[PDB]
Amino acid sequence: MPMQMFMQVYDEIQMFLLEELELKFDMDPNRVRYLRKMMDTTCLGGKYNRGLTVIDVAESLLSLSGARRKRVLHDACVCGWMIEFLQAHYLVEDDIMDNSHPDVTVQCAINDGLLLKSWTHMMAMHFFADRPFLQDLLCRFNRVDYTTAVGQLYDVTSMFDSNDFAEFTLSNYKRIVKYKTAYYTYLLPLVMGLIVSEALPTVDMGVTEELAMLMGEYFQVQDDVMDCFTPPERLGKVGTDIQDAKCSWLAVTFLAKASSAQVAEFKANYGSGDSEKVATVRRLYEEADLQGDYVAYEAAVAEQVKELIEKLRLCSPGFAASVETLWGKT
Amino acid sequence: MPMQMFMQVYDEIQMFLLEELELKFDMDPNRVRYLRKMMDTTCLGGKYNRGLTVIDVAESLLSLSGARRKRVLHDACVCGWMIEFLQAHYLVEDDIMDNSHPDVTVQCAINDGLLLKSWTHMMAMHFFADRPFLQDLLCRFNRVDYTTAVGQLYDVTSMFDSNDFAEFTLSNYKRIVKYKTAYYTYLLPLVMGLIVSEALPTVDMGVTEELAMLMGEYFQVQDDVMDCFTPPERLGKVGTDIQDAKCSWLAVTFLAKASSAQVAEFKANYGSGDSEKVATVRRLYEEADLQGDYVAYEAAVAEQVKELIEKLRLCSPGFAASVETLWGKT
Numbered sequence: 001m002p003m004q005m006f007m008q009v010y011d012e013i014q015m016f017l018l019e020e021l022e023l024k025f026d027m028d029p030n031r032v033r034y035l036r037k038m039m040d041t042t043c044l045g046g047k048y049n050r051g052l053t054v055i056d057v058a059e060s061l062l063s064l065s066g067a068r069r070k071r072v073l074h075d076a077c078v079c080g081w082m083i084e085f086l087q088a089h090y091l092v093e094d095d096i097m098d099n100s101h102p103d104v105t106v107q108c109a110i111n112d113g114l115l116l117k118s119w120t121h122m123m124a125m126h127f128f129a130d131r132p133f134l135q136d137l138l139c140r141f142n143r144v145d146y147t148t149a150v151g152q153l154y155d156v157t158s159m160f161d162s163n164d165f166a167e168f169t170l171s172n173y174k175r176i177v178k179y180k181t182a183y184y185t186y187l188l189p190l191v192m193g194l195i196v197s198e199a200l201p202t203v204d205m206g207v208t209e210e211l212a213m214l215m216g217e218y219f220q221v222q223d224d225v226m227d228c229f230t231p232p233e234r235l236g237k238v239g240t241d242i243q244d245a246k247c248s249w250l251a252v253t254f255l256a257k258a259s260s261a262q263v264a265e266f267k268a269n270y271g272s273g274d275s276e277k278v279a280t281v282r283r284l285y286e287e288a289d290l291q292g293d294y295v296a297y298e299a300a301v302a303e304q305v306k307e308l309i310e311k312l313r314l315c316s317p318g319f320a321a322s323v324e325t326l327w328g329k330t
Numbered sequence: 331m332p333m334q335m336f337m338q339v340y341d342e343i344q345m346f347l348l349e350e351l352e353l354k355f356d357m358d359p360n361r362v363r364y365l366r367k368m369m370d371t372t373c374l375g376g377k378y379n380r381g382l383t384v385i386d387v388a389e390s391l392l393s394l395s396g397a398r399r400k401r402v403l404h405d406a407c408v409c410g411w412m413i414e415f416l417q418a419h420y421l422v423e424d425d426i427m428d429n430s431h432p433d434v435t436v437q438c439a440i441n442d443g444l445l446l447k448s449w450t451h452m453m454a455m456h457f458f459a460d461r462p463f464l465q466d467l468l469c470r471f472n473r474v475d476y477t478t479a480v481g482q483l484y485d486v487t488s489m490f491d492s493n494d495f496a497e498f499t500l501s502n503y504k505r506i507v508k509y510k511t512a513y514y515t516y517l518l519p520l521v522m523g524l525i526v527s528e529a530l531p532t533v534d535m536g537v538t539e540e541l542a543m544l545m546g547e548y549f550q551v552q553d554d555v556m557d558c559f560t561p562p563e564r565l566g567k568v569g570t571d572i573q574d575a576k577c578s579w580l581a582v583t584f585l586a587k588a589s590s591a592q593v594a595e596f597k598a599n600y601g602s603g604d605s606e607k608v609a610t611v612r613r614l615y616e617e618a619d620l621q622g623d624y625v626a627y628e629a630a631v632a633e634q635v636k637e638l639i640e641k642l643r644l645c646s647p648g649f650a651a652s653v654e655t656l657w658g659k660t
């Protein structure tokens with residue numbers, strides 16, 4: 001029922017956006033079908049964890065606050081696709097970076113990125129045109145998107161001086177995770193699920209803001225370890241954090257417990273494409289017993305999570321049930 | 331006074347955005363100064379025609395509807411910088427297309443483009459937080475930005491089949507100009523000048539929508555001719571429409587009046603980087619007496635402009651005065 005309803009609303013949103021282009025933006029059929037295919041390619045195929053979280057939060061709040069049910073659930077589905085389209089927009093922006101007479105494919109990728117973001121506004125301004133929360137919804141949505149771009153700046157420049165390992169600290173690693181990932185992947189679906197369910201001012205946002213960061217941190221640490229040791233056919237991609245000199249959880253944890261000569265060996269091999277230097281970095285990670293620290297670090301975060309949901313249920317009980325399922329996915 | 335006040339408000343907007351990053355987004359001073367420099371580089375230096383138009387419209391409406399004056403003028407200045415930042419965002423997006431281990435400059439250019447657009451939202455959500463028109467302002471702003479991305483799709487793909495000279499028509503040329511340029515360069519500053527001056531529903535939008543398209547068309551035709559014949563040291567850039575196979579006013583006008591063998595000569599030489607093929611295209615344009623048609627075409631548009639402002643002044647007199655100055659700039 002959740003996934004089945006989420007995909008129906010996708011068809012409704014897609015048909016509106018495409019008919020609008022045809023009827024109000026003078027778009028020819030060839031370009032309409034081209035945009036239908038681009039939308040399907042960039043927005044479908046993932047796991048929809050951000051989008052379904054909006055729905056799951058919405059259904060947990062109409063059970064403990066007829067016509068209001070069907071509307072809030074439809075509003076939740078539109079908000080879920082707003083985040084999925086936003087995620088599609090961020091992924092297209094990422095493809096432009098690593099993919100490289102006018103090059104029409106790079107022009108169309110940039111254009112795709114702009115269209116995907118504008119579509120989040122267009123579907124909100126339509127399906128929520130008569131909702132009182134539309135203005136508060138756009139502001140929080142626009143501010144989270146801004147937060148994510150700030151976090152991408154922190155991430156992309158963590159090894160240089162904005163016109164280097166000084167910013168390879170655990171507090172800065174959390175700053176990157178917080179802004180680049182946590183706010184839009186964990187906080188935004190929760191907040192949107194509370195807005196369409198009218199229960200936004202009925203929750204402790206501090207505990208909510210704190211769980212979102214901790215779940216994002218838990219998720220990103222596991223992602224960093226898998227990027228380095230999970231083989232490509234099992235990970236789904238080629239792990240490239242060592243080559244890209246990323247400020248990963250492995251790197252900042254290694255630097256805190258490495259010897260002076262080992263740090264020199266790490267600094268001399270990090271951020272290179274050579275297969276032996278990357279393997280030297282993985283050798284240092286293994287010999288530093290970083291795996292054993294990974295298990296303990298996640299445990300303490302999980303304890304902070306499994307105990308922070310309790311503060312949230314003292315004043316917002318139904319909310320805490322959905323946050324547990326979101327944590328279960330992580 | 332106009333330009334002097336516009337630059338003061340820029341300092342006020344810049345200080346808010348940068349202090350917000352420092353105080354609310356945990357940004358370090360090195361990155362704050364880097365963003366101040368990026369903002370100055372991308373947003374300053376132009377002619378500010380879009381931004382000053384918001385001011386000029388606002389002052390013409392408080393003269394024919396104390397504290398309300400100073401506030402509307404400040405609101406107009408913030409709206410002017412919203413369009414300038416939007417223009418800066420579009421220009422960065424254009425630089426990414428023709429400019430081409432993680433390439434940190436392409437990463438930072440993409441990031442710059444995202445920040446510049448988000449800044450238009452951030453400055454609106456702050457300085458207009460208590461304005462009743464904030465929601466209507468964002469919607470029209472978001473819809474014009476969407477329109478511009480649709481127009482970039484029409485422009486970038488005018489020579490292919492979205493997965494060719496069939497779309498090289500005068501009606502399609504106007505569609506490109508309308509969406510890609512007219513809406514955000516001519517209609518948007520006028521609309522924003524009416525919103526902050528509370529005189530949005532007091533004007534005939536049809537005549538206004540029609541003047542904006544015609545002025546954009548007038549401006550783009552002159553721009554197309556200069557791209558082809560104005561030398562680089564006098565134009566300010568290297569003209570590249572022939573090489574890029576653009577759907578320019580010269581190309582669509584030539585194809586309507588060329589002979590069968592000339593069209594074959596045009597089609598065989600258009601869209602190439604070779605110096606002799608580009609010169610062959612300019613030879614065809616000259617021999618087709620396109621310059622003589624350019625003067626007449628602009629005259630008829632000017633007549634349509636010099637006469638459409640009159641319909642606007644029958645119900646909105648002060649508006650028409652500013653539209654004339656905007657037309658004078660063109």
Ligand SMILES: NCc1ccc(F)c(Cl)c1
Pocket residue numbers: 225229282285286290291292294
């Ligand atoms: N060195 C092999 C390895 C496997 C799994 C892990 F989690 C880590 Cl850190 C390291």
Ligand SMILES: NCc1ccc(F)c(Cl)c1
Pocket residue numbers: 555559612615616620621622624
């Ligand atoms: N062929 C030279 C030339 C100069 C000015 C123009 F406007 C045109 Cl169309 C052509």
Ligand code: NA
Pocket residue numbers: 046047048049050051084087
């Ligand atoms: Na998702």
Ligand code: NA
Pocket residue numbers: 376377378379380381414417
């Ligand atoms: Na301008």
